[PDB]
Symmetry: C3
Subunit: 257 residues, 3 copies
């Protein structure tokens, strides 16, 4: 919108947002349903993204309760409304899915560092939300599962690309085509978690990471993330040119100050 | 061909094929030569690929005996016929090598999951065959070696791309330009094996993986593999579009049933 | 130049070069400043690259003393000359940075295998130098840090691409946007080191790697490195074609001998 979602509107969609200076914390807030996700949840995540204050540069996504997210609410695969919105002509459906994917795409923005702090299960859409973030910090209780193929579906919430980046195509095939669940130890071995900590220490681990990030100047953090996101698809000559162009802008700003 | 290779024809090329419903098992069957590969073997692997029944969605490649494959039969580097076929103008040679590479390229098909179950040495062409599969399960006896450069040759049986995907360019350079042999522990550390099991347990490990794969519906498995194979080279916007296009086709099929 | 830099010229830039047959050893030689790098150092590294004898196929980069490199000399961020050269219109600056990046780009050449042998800290530009090499062998004393963002700068000495290749985009974001220091154990876990050895064993480990590399014929090593560098950005069909084209050239040369 132009208007940021209100706390009341977010509560109706199963979310909480708090902002403290440069840090925004989004909490999945349907513990009674193990933070199962709905269309409304996804479109409100997109609206949070589109309306975040310019000063926010770090976004932490957490769940309430012991489970990060059990994935799509199973009510979404029936006729009636969910979270007040009507569930899932082909063009229409395509537009709807695109609208949901917007809730995950913004987590890649160069001007934020997005962090998923995952306890318990992150299943399907929930795994994809965690994959969509820059960084994952897992509790030792975390369990990850790309469940969609077991349901007859593909992963369509933008998780395929980060999965392949993290684990390689071959392991991605094995995880997705078995739809198996992996524990935090395995997740760490496969580079799916940047850090694994004891459950009781997850909030402190997130806070420590946030403090490290805040200590690096915002503009250099943003420029560097933008460079890193381009590096895999550019040839080396091109990437060197992109790097130097970015450095010229940093030097120009530092000269102004 | 139109016609699948017969068991007799395959035996003359050093191979066995058995099909049981949705699963095909190809066994390299020259244990007396440590499953060294020949031109005939490669072109018959291509013909198996081209003629597989539509119902087959899983392909397991194994060796007979303690060695997966010692790589190219050293008789291939002389004048006389091998396996009845004449060994390796420049255009002709190029066509011949292309014909051999077809024996490995089909293992990437989206409609199959290919699994290499590797005991003992997988050298050169043998390593490349294992690399060409989606998944590798290694015995604790497995030893892998990209030998070609030590012989004055390059890897030309399609192994370079999967190697780089699995281990990264830098480690790939180190493994290939030293032509060193690595053991199963190292192979697991480097992501070259998805699983390492005791030698006596390799058949059971393959069966367990096959059972997991069969439990996921075929059409969703195929669509998801197709998505995963595209993810590395697409930008994120494009991959999101590809994902949603694939989901629309899944939803349309699920609606028909 | 046409002329290789002299030992005297290199000493003035903080470097030593020795060549013994097929192996060149470049040593960063300002231990009193912890091998901090300067513009002159970078441009002389480029000149070493451009003038290396054709017979050199292996390049080892080491530091004198306990620290590989503390990164850019802090004198480079002031008015006066450094190493006799004047420090860092926008076009001019762009040309200057491009000239420095040439000191790192040549380490990717297909006709060499470049090896960084790292003790102690490799910070910023120093980390990027190590990243620019094909292979890193670390002492157990090694500490790596992408410091630039903490200084308000981006990494612009060509390190972004190898970093992302080695560790994946997500971990690269975490390392760069925290500007944190990692130890050799972590570096090994993240694939930043191909090998980690005890400090006293680093020279022997480098020598052992050099011996393995020399045992593989030069032309096959060069062709294979060239193939590996292309594999990530090519589709599989294309890479198979590139591989076979390269094999035809190997077979033609082997037939001549
Ligand atoms: S996108 C892909 C698809 N997602 C899924 O298949 C996941 C479905 N859920 C699960 O597998 C399990 O709930 C787990 C593993 C997440 C948690 O298991 P448990 O810890 O045993 O908790 P339990 O299953 O009792 O769940 C607690 C409550 O959350 C509800 N719930 C859990 N997941 C979902 C969901 N996806 N949709 C709707 N409700 C859910 C349960 O129905 C249960 O409700 P109840 O208290 O009224 O019985
Ligand atoms: S593509 C790249 C090139 N390939 C190669 O360099 C591998 C050649 N082979 C080897 O290094 C070894 O045979 C190993 C490591 C595979 C196995 O070693 P060992 O277990 O000691 O078994 P051994 O070498 O005795 O081999 C058993 C038999 O297979 C034969 N054999 C093994 N590899 C090959 C091959 N590539 N071509 C032809 N015959 C072979 C051996 O000549 C031997 O025959 P024999 O029983 O008539 O003597
Ligand atoms: S590109 C990015 C930027 N680079 C940096 O921030 C690194 C700066 N240096 C450091 O952090 C530290 O020197 C370390 C970690 C490398 C080594 O720490 P220590 O082992 O405690 O050694 P110490 O800091 O005393 O350094 C030894 C000498 O090298 C000098 N030195 C170290 N790094 C640099 C540098 N980048 N520029 C100039 N001089 C340097 C120190 O000033 C010191 O000089 P002195 O003997 O005249 O006091």
């Amino acid at each position: 919108q132009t208007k940021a979602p209100t706390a009341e509107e977010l509560a109706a969609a199963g979310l909480t947002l708090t902002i403290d200076g440069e840090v925004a914390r989004i909490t999945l807030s349907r513990p009674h349903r193990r933070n199962a996700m709905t269309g409304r949840m996804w479109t409100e995540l997109a609206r949070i993204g589109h309306t975040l204050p310019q000063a926010v540069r770090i976004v932490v996504i957490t769940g309430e309760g012991p489970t990060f997210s059990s994935g799509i609410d199973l009510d979404m695969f029936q006729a009636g409304k969910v979270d007040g919105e009507p569930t899932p002509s082909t063009a229409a459906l395509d537009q709807v899915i695109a609208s949901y994917q917007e809730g995950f795409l913004w987590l890649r923005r160069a001007d934020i560092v997005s962090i998923a702090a995952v306890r318990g299960h992150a299943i399907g859409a929930g795994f994809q939300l965690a994959l969509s973030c820059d960084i994952r910090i897992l509790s030792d209780t975390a369990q990850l599962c790309m469940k969609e193929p077991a349901l007859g579906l593909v992963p369509d919430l933008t998780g395929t690309q980060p999965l392949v980046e993290l684990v390689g195509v071959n392991r991605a095939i094995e995880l997705c085509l078995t739809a198996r669940t992996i524990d935090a130890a395995e997740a760490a071995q496969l580079r799916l978690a940047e850090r694994v900590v004891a459950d009781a220490e997850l909030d402190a681990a997130v806070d420590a990471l946030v403090a490290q990030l805040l200590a690096v100047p915002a503009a250099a953090a943003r420029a560097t993330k933008e460079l890193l996101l381009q590096a895999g698809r550019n040839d080396l000559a091109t990437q060197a040119r992109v790097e130097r162009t970015a450095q010229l802008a940093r030097l120009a700003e530092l000269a102004k100050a």
